[PDB]
Point group: C2
Chain length 271, copies 2
């Protein structure tokens, strides 16, 4: 038994956690895994990865790469009837997929800050080339609007701590000082926290911060980071079970949404 | 062209960075990669992984799993004449390998602290079940001894930030307060830094900290972490080039040591 995985760079935290879980579950079920890391940027790069995987005679494909509606459909077409499961797409795209609830994750972050009394909020989005970053940013805007709040600033990073530091420092140097920040992932949040601290402000007391992912490291940031938990292990594990069920015609044909939750720590307080 | 990789959990930072580089270089050279994640703990688990990889008809193997001398030799024997390259072993083991210079990494950390004037030093080692953690701990002791210093305490963690936090808090709660700490990796260092800070002390000014790896996140810890850079991308990239050369009988037959360097940041000051 052999399956193939087309994945975003494993140098990134989220992708590596998902693939680790995929490999663990595959081993458990007696399936070997061919892994192809996408050259990044573009549906063509992903199609090439899929082509190479099919050449290795895989009987199932897990696409752990961000794709918009049309591109995901295009990649599915390239799988040549071999079952394909997508893990980084919109839940509206008509393909087989499993993704985390972006509606719940963004609502949780916004409602948490609103409930604490925050009105001056800034957003630090992930790279908009990524469907996940886009869904997250759209969600923040949706719930902030529902709470009759317009953010005082919104910027874009690249998932790295340094981008969080740079974007936050640029915002602060501009004279824009929110009482709270919604950040696209924990690593960028770490960067934001450093920027806040080096600017002579207190994370939490002066500027609250909410991350996203609930990485193992987040519990030890200074101070511990309030974030949105995305159970990557569960996603990876479930993707293998699902793919094998699909390959045997006993699964389904559509999208599954996995729940997320708010992890309250030490970076969020009333303004 | 197809190669196989037996690897430690990709949930771990170092392994994921190495494998990412392996996949990138493999793609560049037109080689597909079958990846097997070891069930952890034991030479038997690694042998099983190798067996499954050989069943997929790989023509080369990269062993990215910690193995002592005898176990590495045993795993090599199990590769059935298929070229095998080890990335987590001692450089004294008579097999093909590429590892970072532990002698240089430990000397750099010790000499940096000694040069700053530190005499009261504590050690926080990685899990001793890992050859890398063992070589690192032995190295610290070697150079501390050469500088006529006996550490005031030495503990063991598990590579995670939480283990660094727990071990450091336990040390401090015991009344053992060093002026500097040598920590086995950046994540455990993050945990130590949190413990120090929550104990009412200043990282750097009160207790200096040196990490290991130079993770992307380390530049944004609070404060930025002085550490030892291990270029995982270079290691992964080089391992692919080396394996293919070995498969064509144009490489060598032995160990290569990759250099490391000290990255001075904000967590190390005179006592």
């Amino acid at each position: 038994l052999l399956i193939g995985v087309a994945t975003s760079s494993l140098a990134l935290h989220a992708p590596s956690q998902i693939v680790a879980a995929i490999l663990s579950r595959a081993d458990q079920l007696g399936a070997s895994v061919v892994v192809s890391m996408v050259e990044r940027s573009g549906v063509e790069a992903c199609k090439t990865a899929v082509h190479n995987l099919l050449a290795q005679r895989v009987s199932g494909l897990i696409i752990n790469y961000p794709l918009d509606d049309q591109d995901a459909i295009a990649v599915e077409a390239a799988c040549t009837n071999v079952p394909a499961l997508f893990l980084d797409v919109s839940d509206q795209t008509p393909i087989n997929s499993i993704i985390f609830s972006h509606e719940d994750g963004t609502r949780l972050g916004v409602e948490h800050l609103v409930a604490l009394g925050h009105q001056q909020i800034a957003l630090l989005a992930g790279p908009l080339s990524s469907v996940s970053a886009r869904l997250r940013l759209a969600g923040w805007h949706k719930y902030l609007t529902r709470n009759q709040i317009q953010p005082i600033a919104e910027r874009e990073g690249d998932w790295s701590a340094m981008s969080g530091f740079q974007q936050t420092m640029q915002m602060l140097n501009e004279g824009i000082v929110p009482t709270a920040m919604l950040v696209a992932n924990d690593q960028m949040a770490l960067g934001a926290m450093r920027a806040i601290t080096e600017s002579g402000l207190r994370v939490g007391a002066d500027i609250s911060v909410v991350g996203y992912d609930d990485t193992e490291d987040s519990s030890c940031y200074i101070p511990p980071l309030t974030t949105i938990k995305q159970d990557f292990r569960l996603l990876g594990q479930t993707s293998v079970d699902r793919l094998l069920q699909l390959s045997q015609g006993q699964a389904v044909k559509g999208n599954q949404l996995l729940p997320v939750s708010l992890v309250k720590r030490k970076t969020t307080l009333a303004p």
